């Protein structure tokens, strides 16, 4: 029995589709044989505990563009075969309990973008060993703690752009051995730890533009063996003696890199660091070469 | 009498080499029998017209990494057997007279990268039908005029990355029948004419990443029958109905391509267009948006 005004059909998968119905809550009586559930475009404000626990064969769950303000920690109990979870475009969600995604060992894609998330609680992504795509962009994250993605050994795409991340700690990207694309642009990153990119040996794309980086440590880009593309524009780069290690790296980098506009001193304003000669990077708590 | 700043010999070819000498100008008294001249790594600012005109057997001329601000239109007058000319790493050059490379029917490689070239004069690459490599990357090219490489029938490599080229006209690449690699990445390319790749049948590599391409007609990739490597990433792709032709092309293309990440709409942001479904490419000036 199909609930409400939803559409229930069997091919290509058993699907319960209830998009854009003004639903205030998850409808009861969803067929337990459902493999895909589409609840996007509604006004659902909360997801109570075990809202879909009868749908053991559920692989796809869409809840984006709702009015989510609270997701119960046990909301996804019994969904061991879930592969896709779309919770995006829920600007009033703000916080997800760190135990919410536990047990989702088959989860391959997780959409948490534009949800107003303020923090990433410890253990939020624990045990998601099959995760490949993590969308965290356009939130309100003001920190990127260590070991946040420790168990995500299969993650290939991580999107953190459009947040308020102030810095990149040493073990923020630990365990991300399969990461291919890391987009951190449009944040507030004022500093990166010297060994923060240790496990990113397979990273091909790294976006760091539109941040607040004045300098980059020495050999911080050394582990990036597979790096093909690098974006460092729109940053207050200080082009004095401290910029010599980055300048020498950009001359040897056989991949593609963007412009590195200098912000200080006044005479070198809007000058690409890659074009400059080594003689221009002379002079100056302060860096060691000062 | 070899110049004191230079080292002259003739074991492979007659060579007059004076690199990294701080020379203010071209040294006088260069042996006329020279087949290779290396003036790279100095502070030469001007290349007069009477220079090198005696070296009728000159094949290699190294002038990269200098302070070149002006090169006379007849600087390479009697250099008919000149095969390689390296003028790169001269940011203060800016302009090159369109008659500079006339008569160099034996020139195989031409380095003009990192010269601050703001434009490409008409007939600049005229007659250079022996040219195979053309280095124009990392300059300030604000346009790509029609028939710019019309006579470059033997050109295999064309490097045009790091400029500010806003678009690709219909006949910007006419005559490049032998073109093998075409690097147009890191520019301001916003639109490509539907027949811009007409004569690029033997093209294998095409880089268009880091540009301003919101859409790209699938008809422009039809002539590229030899295409093996395509990079379209880092573009403001709009993945709606207008991207359906480009999408169907990526499904049939069995060569290695980069990701085509969607910039708009927001729900498809950072999603690879190749991995999307045709149902995702619906809705919305493009002709499919209005109906
Ligand atoms: C789920 O799939 C299994 C195997 O196909 C089937 O036996 C079961 O009835 C389905 N529905 C459930 C567990 O609700
Ligand atoms: C991670 O990817 C590898 C490579 O395909 C695969 O063998 C493995 O099963 C994946 N891990 C999980 C938990 O799915
Ligand atoms: C970061 O840089 C932006 C410009 O890209 C600037 O508006 C902003 O004030 C900077 N913030 C800090 C903390 O430096
Ligand atoms: C160039 O070479 C030819 C034959 O090797 C020789 O006859 C001629 O004099 C040379 N040109 C000079 C030395 O200017
Ligand atoms: C173009 O190259 C071919 C061989 O690659 C050669 O036979 C031909 O003479 C060249 N054309 C010119 C004008 O030098
Ligand atoms: C990029 O291309 C768009 C056209 O879609 C244009 O509006 C914009 O000004 C361009 N920006 C730059 C920096 O060239
Ligand atoms: Cl708020
Ligand atoms: Cl560049
Ligand atoms: Cl470059």
UniProtKB/Swiss-Prot annotation, chain B:
What is one cellular component GO term in this UniProt entry?
Answer: growth cone
After translation, the protein is modified as follows: N-glycosylated. O-glycosylated. Contains terminal sialic acid groups on its glycan chains.
The effect of disrupting this gene, in the record's words, is: Mice are born at the expected Mendelian rate, are viable and fertile. They display subtle changes in exploratory behavior, manifest deficits in spatial working memory performance, and show impaired ability to stay on a rotarod. Compared to wild-type littermates, cultured hippocampus neurons from mutant mice display an increased number of excitatory synapses. Effects on neurite outgrowth are controversial and may depend on the mouse strain, cell type, and the experimental conditions. Cultured neurons display impaired axon growth cone collapse in response to myelin, MAG and RTN4.
Name the major location: membrane
Provide the topology term for how it sits in the membrane.
Lipid-anchor; GPI-anchor
Expressing tissues: Detected in embryonic hippocampus neurons. Detected in brain (at protein level). Detected in neurons in the neocortex, in hippocampus, dorsal thalamus, cerebellum granule cell layer and the mitral cell layer in the olfactory bulb. Detected in brain, dorsal root ganglion and heart.
Single GO MF annotation: chondroitin sulfate binding
From the Swiss-Prot or TrEMBL record, give the protein name.
Reticulon-4 receptor
Q: In which organism is this protein found?
A: Mus musculus (Mouse)
Shown part of the complete sequence: 27 to 337 of 473
């Amino acid at each position: 029995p199909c609930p409400g005004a939803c559409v229930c059909y069997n091919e290509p998968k058993v699907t319960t589709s209830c998009p854009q119905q003004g639903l205030q809550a998850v409808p009861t009586g969803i067929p337990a044989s459902s493999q895909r559930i589409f609840l996007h475009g509604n006004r659902i404000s909360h997801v109570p505990a075990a809202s879909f626990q009868s749908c053991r064969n559920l692989t796809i769950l869409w809840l984006h563009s709702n009015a989510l303000a609270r997701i119960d920690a046990a909301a996804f109990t019994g969904l061991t075969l879930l592969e896709q979870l779309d919770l995006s475009d829920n600007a009033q969600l703000h916080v997800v309990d760190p135990t919410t995604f536990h047990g989702l060992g088959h989860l391959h894609t997780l959409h948490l973008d534009r949800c107003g998330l303020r923090e990433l609680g410890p253990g939020l992504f624990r045990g998601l060993a099959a995760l490949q795509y993590l969308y965290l962009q356009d939130n309100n994250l003001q920190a990127l703690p260590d070991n946040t993605f420790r168990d995500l050994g299969n993650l290939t795409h991580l999107f953190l752009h459009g947040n308020r991340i102030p810095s990149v700690p040493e073990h923020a990207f630990r365990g991300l051995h399969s990461l291919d694309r890391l987009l951190l642009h449009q944040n507030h990153v004022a500093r990166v730890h010297p060994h923060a990119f240790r496990d990113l040996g397979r990273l091909m794309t790294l976006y760091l533009f539109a941040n607040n980086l004045s300098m980059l440590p020495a050999e911080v880009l050394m582990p990036l063996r597979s790096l093909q593309y690098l974006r460092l524009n729109d940053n207050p780069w200080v082009c004095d003696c401290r910029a010599r290690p980055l300048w020498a790296w950009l001359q040897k980098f056989r991949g593609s890199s963007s412009e590195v506009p200098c912000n200080l001193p006044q005479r070198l304003a809007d000058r690409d660091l890659k074009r400059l000669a080594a003689s221009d990077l002379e002079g100056c708590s302060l860096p060691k070469c000062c």
